[PDB]
From a paper:
HAdV-D10 is a rare serotype isolated from the eyes of patients with conjunctivitis. HAdV are non-enveloped viruses measuring 90–100 nm and arranged in an icosahedral capsid with protruding fiber proteins at the pentameric vertices. Structural and biological studies of HAdV-D10 knob protein highlighted low-affinity engagement with native adenoviral receptors CAR and sialic acid. HAdV-D10 possesses characteristics of a promising virotherapy, combining low seroprevalence, weak receptor interactions, and reduced off-target uptake.
We produced a 2.5-Å crystal structure of HAdV-D10 fiber knob and modeled interactions with known viral receptors, and SPR was used to investigate binding of HAdV-D10 fiber knob with CAR, CD46, and DSG2. (A) 2.5-Å crystal structure of the HAdV-D10 fiber knob protein (HAdV-D10K). HAdV-D10 displayed weak but detectable binding to all three receptors. The highest-affinity interaction was with CAR. Predictive homology was used to model HAdV-D10K in complex with CAR, and the position of the DG loop interface indicated that HAdV-D10 can bind CAR, albeit at a lower affinity than HAdV-C5. Using recombinant HAdV-D10K protein, we confirmed binding to CAR in vitro with a 16.5-fold lower affinity than HAdV-C5K, as indicated by the IC50 values and demonstrated that CAR-binding HAdV-C5 recombinant knob blocks HAdV-C5/D10K infection. We conclude that, although the binding is weak, HAdV-D10 can bind and use CAR as an entry receptor. Although several binding sites were identified, we determined that HAdV-D10K forms weak interactions with CD46, insufficient for cell entry. We inserted A20 into the DG loop of HAdV-D10 fiber knob. Predictive models of HAdV-D10 fiber knob with A20 peptide depict the interaction with αvβ6 integrin.
Numbering used by the authors:
A (entry chain C), B (entry chain A), C (entry chain B): 187 to 369
């Protein structure tokens, strides 16, 4: 019945380019073997806050990585900030370091690490989100499972966008996906 | 009380242009701190029944708003009709039109009401349907949360389309999205 | 509360053109009135294994039919392998096979049988996925409910190859969706 969330405030809690240059809104909810994911991003400061390509054409994609361990707790090298992310209990988070996130992860069976046994997987969930909420302004949230090393589990976000966006602010829409639980 | 749904019987329950010319087969289900949600539409009379752009090239958008009070009871001036909406029980609706849908609403903190605060695009869920079942006939469904006045919560579906169609019936294909729970 | 899936042990259970020449990774979840499905396919052998639209000029579509009876028990004339498909209950298999109980099927009301009534467009849930996880290489995954014959409930998966593409192995990107349950 439980839910594990990043308090959905406008107070930043994620670093891509510079310290807390972004708030990342993710709510992950579990049912048996299937977890439902609702993600949203606002980029409040730095290089990815404003997209002007007519000056900076090279910036047409960047990536975020939620690395976990054997017990499935989020590492602090992970672009996200540890003091915002915890099992929900009303609007509060219950102000104690959690654990026991075994299962909340992308199944190693269904989504294996890139082990020497050479199979080409089908892990990737593509999608889409539009910046400002304008239709004419699309982007490609590419989410990949269990393709980062050092960790046990991993959820990486590979955002791309080809267009010639001048003073578009990086505040996405909301996108919903599910992934297969390890337990 | 697993589901606050429209009985799925394709009997018009919805007024876009004339008194009950559409059926809205919206369905919503509680997953703690998410609300997983499906939506179809059939328009079976009136100005948005058969679509001919050639003749009516300026007609390529319409809207369906739900408006909910402090207690989360669908306000009457909603496009959808109060006497078609309640919790499912088997095939009927638990034999009532209940007084407690608090918990089945879009969180204000997540998708706040209009302020002098910067409104971000994360209020919006972009998806696409297809009319008939033809690949070649898409339109956009853009659902937005708590962006409407005169109410405490609001779920507004805007249907746009961008293709010069000729004599096309507005029956759509199911879609699925989720939004974070107020409680 | 249960999940009704196939063990993702990349062990070809699905037949398209020739016996067990594909692995269909489908996983269904009771979200009460709604099922939360997540689907995938791998072609390890056959014609569809390796696609090349230069030698075979036609870009033939295909299908994957899952027919259930009055109790929701996958008939044996289906494309998938009947043995591999059950309740994990924590990714186990408790050796009991008396399964007359299942609200995992698509409501016959919200999605009727083809003959007994003129048919509407919300039979279907349209999907779009990339083969090889490459943006330039997209396909189409059309899904239909109770649109088969000599059965009681039928979730059939239509795939379509769009453009002309050369020396690609069939491995689709993950895709997520939901429908209205019978009971």
């Amino acid at each position: 019945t439980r839910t594990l969330w990043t308090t959905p405030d406008t107070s930043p809690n994620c670093t891509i380019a510079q310290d807390k240059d972004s708030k990342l809104t993710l709510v992950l909810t579990k049912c048996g073997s299937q977890i439902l994911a609702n993600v949203s991003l606002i980029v409040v400061a730095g290089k990815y806050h404003i997209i002007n390509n007519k000056n900076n054409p090279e910036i047409k994609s960047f990536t975020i990585k939620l690395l976990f361990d054997k017990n499935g707790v989020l590492l602090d090298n992970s672009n996200l900030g540890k003091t915002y992310w915890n099992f929900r209990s009303g609007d509060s988070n219950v102000s104690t370091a959690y654990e026991k996130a075994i299962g909340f992860m992308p199944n190693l069976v269904a989504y294996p690490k890139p082990s020497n046994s050479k199979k080409y997987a089908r892990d990737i969930v593509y999608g889409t989100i539009y910046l400002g909420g304008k239709p004419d302004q699309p982007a490609v949230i590419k989410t990949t499972f269990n393709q980062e090393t050092g960790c046990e589990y991993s959820i990486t976000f590979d955002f791309s966008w080809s267009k010639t966006y001048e003073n578009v602010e990086f505040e996405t829409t909301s996108f919903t996906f599910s992934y297969i639980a390890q337990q």
